Design a protein around this motif. Structure first.
Motif, PDB file in Angstrom:
ATOM      1  N   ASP A 508     -19.290 -31.106  22.332  1.00 48.35           N
ATOM      2  CA  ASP A 508     -18.325 -30.337  21.946  1.00 48.35           C
ATOM      3  C   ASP A 508     -18.809 -29.902  20.619  1.00 48.35           C
ATOM      4  OD1 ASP A 508     -14.966 -31.609  23.384  1.00 48.35           O
ATOM      5  OD2 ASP A 508     -16.980 -31.213  24.172  1.00 48.35           O
ATOM      6  N   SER A 509     -19.525 -28.734  20.644  1.00 46.02           N
ATOM      7  CA  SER A 509     -20.494 -28.305  19.558  1.00 46.02           C
ATOM      8  C   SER A 509     -19.902 -26.952  18.854  1.00 46.02           C
ATOM      9  CB  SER A 509     -21.787 -27.942  19.946  1.00 46.02           C
ATOM     10  OG  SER A 509     -22.533 -29.253  20.777  1.00 46.02           O
ATOM     11  N   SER A 510     -18.868 -27.343  17.937  1.00 44.55           N
ATOM     12  CA  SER A 510     -18.262 -26.186  17.184  1.00 44.55           C
ATOM     13  C   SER A 510     -18.960 -25.898  15.758  1.00 44.55           C
ATOM     14  CB  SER A 510     -16.793 -26.595  16.973  1.00 44.55           C
ATOM     15  OG  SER A 510     -16.368 -26.136  15.662  1.00 44.55           O
ATOM     16  N   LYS A 511     -19.077 -27.021  14.896  1.00 46.59           N
ATOM     17  CA  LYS A 511     -19.220 -27.035  13.636  1.00 46.59           C
ATOM     18  C   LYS A 511     -20.777 -26.416  13.369  1.00 46.59           C
ATOM     19  CE  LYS A 511     -16.137 -30.450  12.386  1.00 46.59           C
ATOM     20  NZ  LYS A 511     -15.815 -31.998  12.755  1.00 46.59           N
ATOM     21  N   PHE A 512     -20.776 -25.626  12.197  1.00 43.55           N
ATOM     22  CA  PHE A 512     -21.864 -25.146  11.449  1.00 43.55           C
ATOM     23  C   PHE A 512     -22.636 -26.402  10.839  1.00 43.55           C
ATOM     24  CE2 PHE A 512     -24.517 -22.193   9.227  1.00 43.55           C
ATOM     25  CZ  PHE A 512     -24.785 -22.737   8.047  1.00 43.55           C
ATOM     26  N   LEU A 513     -24.136 -26.323  11.124  1.00 43.53           N
ATOM     27  CA  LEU A 513     -24.875 -27.339  10.521  1.00 43.53           C
ATOM     28  C   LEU A 513     -25.796 -26.743   9.605  1.00 43.53           C
ATOM     29  CD1 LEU A 513     -27.206 -29.501  13.146  1.00 43.53           C
ATOM     30  CD2 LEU A 513     -28.064 -28.513  10.988  1.00 43.53           C
ATOM     31  N   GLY A 514     -26.461 -25.486   9.736  1.00 37.57           N
ATOM     32  CA  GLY A 514     -27.418 -25.169   9.044  1.00 37.57           C
ATOM     33  C   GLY A 514     -27.983 -23.687   9.607  1.00 37.57           C
ATOM     34  N   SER A 515     -29.282 -23.361   9.023  1.00 38.09           N
ATOM     35  CA  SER A 515     -29.557 -22.033   9.466  1.00 38.09           C
ATOM     36  C   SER A 515     -30.790 -21.877   9.451  1.00 38.09           C
ATOM     37  CB  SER A 515     -28.976 -20.930   8.472  1.00 38.09           C
ATOM     38  OG  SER A 515     -29.692 -21.164   7.283  1.00 38.09           O
ATOM     39  N   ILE A 516     -31.396 -20.915  10.032  1.00 35.31           N
ATOM     40  CA  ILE A 516     -32.933 -20.742  10.316  1.00 35.31           C
ATOM     41  C   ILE A 516     -32.980 -19.187  10.134  1.00 35.31           C
ATOM     42  CG2 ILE A 516     -32.963 -20.625  12.754  1.00 35.31           C
ATOM     43  CD1 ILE A 516     -35.840 -20.987  12.908  1.00 35.31           C
ATOM     44  N   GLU A 517     -33.823 -18.639   9.107  1.00 36.11           N
ATOM     45  CA  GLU A 517     -34.222 -17.301   8.866  1.00 36.11           C
ATOM     46  C   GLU A 517     -35.609 -16.817   9.344  1.00 36.11           C
ATOM     47  OE1 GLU A 517     -34.391 -16.335   4.817  1.00 36.11           O
ATOM     48  OE2 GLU A 517     -34.330 -14.152   5.153  1.00 36.11           O
ATOM     49  N   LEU A 518     -35.524 -15.730   9.878  1.00 36.90           N
ATOM     50  CA  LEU A 518     -36.727 -15.416  10.629  1.00 36.90           C
ATOM     51  C   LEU A 518     -37.034 -13.950  10.430  1.00 36.90           C
ATOM     52  CD1 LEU A 518     -35.400 -16.409  14.352  1.00 36.90           C
ATOM     53  CD2 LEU A 518     -37.501 -17.563  13.290  1.00 36.90           C
ATOM     54  N   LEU A 519     -38.329 -13.567  10.581  1.00 37.47           N
ATOM     55  CA  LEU A 519     -38.712 -12.231  10.422  1.00 37.47           C
ATOM     56  C   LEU A 519     -38.573 -11.495  11.461  1.00 37.47           C
ATOM     57  CD1 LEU A 519     -40.889  -9.954   9.617  1.00 37.47           C
ATOM     58  CD2 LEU A 519     -40.084 -10.833   7.640  1.00 37.47           C
ATOM     59  N   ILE A 520     -37.302 -10.913  11.419  1.00 39.02           N
ATOM     60  CA  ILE A 520     -37.020  -9.897  12.593  1.00 39.02           C
ATOM     61  C   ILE A 520     -35.943  -8.692  12.016  1.00 39.02           C
ATOM     62  CG2 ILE A 520     -37.224 -11.753  14.401  1.00 39.02           C
ATOM     63  CD1 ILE A 520     -34.244 -12.319  14.108  1.00 39.02           C
ATOM     64  N   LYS A 521     -35.786  -7.719  12.956  1.00 35.58           N
ATOM     65  CA  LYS A 521     -34.995  -6.701  12.335  1.00 35.58           C
ATOM     66  C   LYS A 521     -33.718  -6.595  13.324  1.00 35.58           C
ATOM     67  CE  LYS A 521     -35.169  -3.698   9.362  1.00 35.58           C
ATOM     68  NZ  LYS A 521     -35.492  -3.683   7.942  1.00 35.58           N
ATOM     69  N   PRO A 522     -32.737  -6.784  12.496  1.00 35.19           N
ATOM     70  CA  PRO A 522     -31.363  -6.798  13.338  1.00 35.19           C
ATOM     71  C   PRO A 522     -31.334  -5.312  14.015  1.00 35.19           C
ATOM     72  CG  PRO A 522     -31.226  -6.810  10.799  1.00 35.19           C
ATOM     73  CD  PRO A 522     -32.573  -7.014  10.983  1.00 35.19           C
ATOM     74  N   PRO A 523     -30.181  -5.250  14.796  1.00 34.21           N
ATOM     75  CA  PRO A 523     -29.265  -6.181  15.506  1.00 34.21           C
ATOM     76  C   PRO A 523     -29.938  -7.243  16.338  1.00 34.21           C
ATOM     77  CG  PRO A 523     -28.659  -4.060  15.882  1.00 34.21           C
ATOM     78  CD  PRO A 523     -29.915  -4.003  15.640  1.00 34.21           C
ATOM     79  N   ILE A 524     -29.316  -8.400  16.542  1.00 33.09           N
ATOM     80  CA  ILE A 524     -30.124  -9.363  17.509  1.00 33.09           C
ATOM     81  C   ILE A 524     -28.731 -10.092  18.222  1.00 33.09           C
ATOM     82  CG2 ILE A 524     -32.042  -9.925  16.508  1.00 33.09           C
ATOM     83  CD1 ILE A 524     -30.864 -12.049  14.963  1.00 33.09           C
ATOM     84  N   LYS A 525     -28.950 -10.589  19.638  1.00 27.57           N
ATOM     85  CA  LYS A 525     -28.099 -11.264  20.231  1.00 27.57           C
ATOM     86  C   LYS A 525     -28.731 -12.696  20.148  1.00 27.57           C
ATOM     87  CE  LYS A 525     -25.885 -10.001  23.961  1.00 27.57           C
ATOM     88  NZ  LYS A 525     -24.920  -9.574  23.274  1.00 27.57           N
ATOM     89  N   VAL A 526     -27.878 -13.760  19.826  1.00 26.59           N
ATOM     90  CA  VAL A 526     -28.173 -15.215  19.884  1.00 26.59           C
ATOM     91  C   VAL A 526     -27.373 -15.980  20.961  1.00 26.59           C
ATOM     92  CG1 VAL A 526     -28.471 -17.204  18.367  1.00 26.59           C
ATOM     93  CG2 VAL A 526     -28.553 -14.814  17.097  1.00 26.59           C
ATOM     94  N   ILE A 527     -28.157 -16.563  21.599  1.00 25.38           N
ATOM     95  CA  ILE A 527     -27.493 -17.588  22.643  1.00 25.38           C
ATOM     96  C   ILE A 527     -27.585 -19.008  22.401  1.00 25.38           C
ATOM     97  CG2 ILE A 527     -27.585 -18.134  25.234  1.00 25.38           C
ATOM     98  CD1 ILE A 527     -28.184 -15.061  25.620  1.00 25.38           C
ATOM     99  N   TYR A 528     -26.699 -19.715  22.409  1.00 31.40           N
ATOM    100  CA  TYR A 528     -26.965 -21.059  22.370  1.00 31.40           C
ATOM    101  C   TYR A 528     -26.905 -21.801  23.632  1.00 31.40           C
ATOM    102  CZ  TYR A 528     -26.242 -19.911  17.258  1.00 31.40           C
ATOM    103  OH  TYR A 528     -26.226 -19.170  16.272  1.00 31.40           O
ATOM    104  N   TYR A 529     -27.736 -22.828  23.759  1.00 30.42           N
ATOM    105  CA  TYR A 529     -27.915 -23.144  25.173  1.00 30.42           C
ATOM    106  C   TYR A 529     -27.825 -24.605  25.227  1.00 30.42           C
ATOM    107  CZ  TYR A 529     -29.747 -23.324  29.994  1.00 30.42           C
ATOM    108  OH  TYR A 529     -30.139 -23.306  31.339  1.00 30.42           O
ATOM    109  N   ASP A 530     -27.059 -25.178  25.916  1.00 28.43           N
ATOM    110  CA  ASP A 530     -27.104 -26.549  25.932  1.00 28.43           C
ATOM    111  C   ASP A 530     -28.243 -27.088  27.135  1.00 28.43           C
ATOM    112  OD1 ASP A 530     -26.528 -29.416  27.387  1.00 28.43           O
ATOM    113  OD2 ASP A 530     -24.449 -29.116  26.436  1.00 28.43           O
ATOM    114  N   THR A 531     -29.202 -27.781  26.638  1.00 26.75           N
ATOM    115  CA  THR A 531     -30.193 -28.192  27.314  1.00 26.75           C
ATOM    116  C   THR A 531     -30.209 -29.286  28.401  1.00 26.75           C
ATOM    117  OG1 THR A 531     -31.269 -29.863  25.667  1.00 26.75           O
ATOM    118  CG2 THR A 531     -32.036 -27.379  25.466  1.00 26.75           C
ATOM    119  N   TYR A 532     -28.921 -29.979  28.473  1.00 24.54           N
ATOM    120  CA  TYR A 532     -28.718 -31.061  29.415  1.00 24.54           C
ATOM    121  C   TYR A 532     -27.619 -30.567  30.364  1.00 24.54           C
ATOM    122  CZ  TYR A 532     -31.124 -34.050  25.723  1.00 24.54           C
ATOM    123  OH  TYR A 532     -31.965 -34.419  24.979  1.00 24.54           O
ATOM    124  N   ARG A 533     -26.465 -29.740  30.210  1.00 20.53           N
ATOM    125  CA  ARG A 533     -25.905 -29.058  30.832  1.00 20.53           C
ATOM    126  C   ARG A 533     -26.471 -27.942  31.724  1.00 20.53           C
ATOM    127  NH1 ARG A 533     -20.301 -31.120  30.751  1.00 20.53           N
ATOM    128  NH2 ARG A 533     -20.127 -32.913  29.209  1.00 20.53           N
TER     129      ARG A 533
END
Ligand SMILES: OC[C@H]1O[C@@H](O[C@H]2[C@H](O)[C@H](O)[C@H](O[C@H]3[C@H](O)[C@H](O)[C@H](O[C@H]4[C@H](O)[C@H](O)[C@H](O)O[C@@H]4CO)O[C@@H]3CO)O[C@@H]2CO)[C@@H](O)[C@@H](O)[C@@H]1O
Ligand code: BMA
Length: 563
Positions: A508-533
């Motif tokens: 039940d993954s709500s909370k913010f944990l941290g961040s990763i900054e990448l050399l990319i040019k916005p805009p972007i779509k970010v998809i978070y994926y449950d690797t078990y379900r």
């Protein structure tokens, strides 16, 4: 010489399976003949060939092979094959081009006499089949079908059955296929293997086991799965006193058991053995080469751990060069050829042979195997051909089965290998006593659904190198690919990824944990994926290169689309 004949050479009758068929489908000719031969598996005794020609000047020379029909049944707990009719010869062909073909049958026996059929005409229509598997010309790290679609192997080793034989594959393969699997590997040796061709002899091949391999290949065809055929395993050339499941004392190659070899070292140079081995390759091409569901011919399982009395690097190298050239030359469809080593870094003297179209890694390592996989994948990029992690586990001794019932080790390996640039998933051992009874297939389905719509042939993926990690309460690591349109991340907790006692995360993954900054040019779509379900947790449109990492228990996949 159970199958000898000593009559004047004559074709007696032929049966043709169909006059019209689809691209890459099986066209089968059955031939009843008489002649003079002591061994129908030896082309110097009897040589059956089908000569096929399309409307575009291409000619195919297909060796024919000796065949016995069987009827299978299951006797409570073992497969039993009943012979049906007399044995006879077959030719198996598969058309590359559509349109019209002409073909005839040619036969020669030991007397020098030669007979041939008239020419017959068949017609080939378009079909849904993608073709044979090749190395991609767009990106040498990956495989493709002839039609240009990628082939990304996802699956496991499924190398032999129990006494239930083909009935085990009736269970294992549909389960694998319905969970995203399109790949497995089978063993054609040593003599105890389900599909062992050299069961009692290196001069004649076992028609029952070859029939079982027919069946499993046909099942793979119906399930759109693709097979690596491993011709021989190291056990055959390893002495009992050397351990590690040795088999030399029982192998048909050994003079004690009727073979030509006084010791396993002579395998590489004994002229009688080389001749029988080429006859075996000819039999394999004849009986199975037509199939687009043969992914690859693999000469050896782990040739480096044959007996050390028998491993002469220069002779093993030359043998691989010469056999790859021979196999290539007699294979009308030019299937991929490979070989493998137990030593995880491999043997550069052999791996760099140009007749071996891709390289492999076997690795059984209990600690920090994620880093070992990344390191081996970076290393083997030097060969500039695809890299398959063809065997993987925690422990060659099988500790996996007791310490990791949930398949976290498999889980970690398949995500690591895909997102580090290998040609496909790490291929697990323990199909029969681990993957199936523990129902671990869901790991593959989650991975397959994550990569399903990604074209690795066009992304020009590079390993992620210049990110900034902003995580405070945990030791999170990342393995990533950066491409033209996508960035693929697998994040794992270094403290939890190697602990196997906890239940599968129900996050039940709500909370913010941290961040990763990448050399990319916005805009972007970010998809978070449950690797078990195997499902999207969250989707997020961003205008900055600071990608939040949500809380996760063990590991988390992120798919980032560059817009
Ligand atoms: O029970 C059917 C059949 O089993 C045969 O033994 C098997 C054994 O059950 C196990 O599956 C083993 O898996 C090996 C396999 O050989 C792999 O290629 C690979 O190898 C390892 C090698 O076997 C040694 O263990 C070596 O030390 O380490 C290698 C890896 O680096 O790893 C797998 C996991 O260990 O395969 C053997 C056959 O090789 C026989 O017992 C047979 O009689 C029996 O009928
Ligand atoms: O089919 C794979 C396995 O499936 C199990 O359910 C049992 O029936 C085993 O005997 C069999 O080997």
């Amino acid at each position: 010489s159970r199958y000898k004949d000593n009559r004047p050479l004559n074709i007696l009758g032929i049966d043709i399976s169909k006059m019209e068929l689809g691209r890459y489908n099986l066209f089968e000719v059955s031939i009843f003949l008489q002649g003079s031969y002591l061994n129908p598996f030896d082309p110097q005794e009897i040589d059956v060939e089908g000569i096929f020609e399309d409307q575009y000047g291409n000619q195919y020379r297909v060796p024919g092979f000796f065949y016995q029909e069987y009827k299978r049944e299951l006797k409570n707990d073992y497969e039993y094959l009943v012979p049906v009719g007399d044995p006879y010869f077959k030719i198996r062909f598969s058309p590359i081009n559509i349109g019209s073909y002409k073909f005839f049958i040619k036969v020669k026996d030991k007397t020098g006499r030669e007979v041939s059929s008239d020419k017959y005409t068949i017609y080939v229509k378009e079909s849904e089949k993608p073709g044979y598997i090749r190395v991609s010309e767009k990106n040498w790290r990956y495989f493709k079908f002839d039609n240009g679609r990628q082939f990304l192997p996802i699956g496991a080793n499924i190398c032999w059955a129990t006494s239930k034989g083909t009935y085990d594959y009736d269970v294992w393969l549909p389960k694998c296929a319905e969970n995203g699997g399109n790949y497995f590997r089978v063993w054609l040796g040593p003599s105890w293997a389900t599909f062992a061709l050299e069961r009692e002899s290196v001069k004649e091949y076992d028609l029952k086991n070859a029939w079982k391999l027919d069946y499993v290949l046909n099942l793979a065809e119906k399930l759109n799965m693709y097979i690596m055929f491993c011709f021989d395993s190291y056990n055959e050339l390893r002495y009992q006193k050397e351990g590690a499941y040795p088999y030399w004392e029982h192998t048909p190659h050994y003079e004690k058991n009727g073979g030509p070899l006084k010791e396993p070292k002579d395998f590489w140079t004994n002229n009688e053995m080389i001749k029988y081995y080429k006859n075996k390759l000819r039999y394999i091409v004849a009986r199975y080469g037509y199939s687009t569901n043969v992914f690859a011919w693999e000469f050896w399982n782990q040739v480096d751990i044959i007996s050390p009395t028998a491993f002469v690097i220069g002779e093993v190298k030359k043998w691989h060069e010469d056999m790859a050239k021979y196999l290539n030359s007699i294979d009308p469809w030019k299937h991929l050829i490979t070989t493998s080593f137990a030593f995880s870094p491999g043997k550069p003297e052999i791996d760099s042979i140009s007749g071996l179209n891709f390289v492999q890694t076997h690795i059984y390592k209990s600690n920090r195997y994620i880093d070992a996989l990344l390191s081996l994948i970076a290393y083997k990029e030097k060969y500039r051909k695809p890299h398959l992690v063809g065997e993987f586990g925690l422990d060659a001794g099988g500790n996996d089965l007791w310490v990791d019932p949930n398949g976290y080790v498999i889980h970690n390996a398949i995500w690591t290998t895909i997102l580090s640039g290998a040609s496909g998933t790490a291929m697990s051992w323990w199909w029969d006593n681990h993957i199936h009874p523990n129902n671990l297939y869901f790991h593959y389905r989650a991975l397959a659904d994550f990569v399903k719509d990604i074209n690795f042939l066009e992304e020009k993926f590079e390993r992620l190198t210049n990110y900034k990690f902003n995580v405070y309460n945990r030791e999170i690591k990342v393995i990533g690919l950066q491409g033209k349109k996508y960035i693929l991340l697998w994040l794992y907790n270094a403290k939890e990824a190697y602990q196997y006692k906890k239940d599968i995360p129900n996050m039940d993954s709500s909370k913010f944990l941290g961040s990763i900054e990448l050399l990319i040019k916005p805009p972007i779509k970010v998809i978070y994926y449950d690797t078990y379900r195997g499902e999207k947790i969250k989707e997020l449109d961003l205008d900055k290169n600071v990608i939040p990492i949500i809380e996760f228990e063990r590991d988390l996949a992120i798919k980032i689309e560059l817009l």
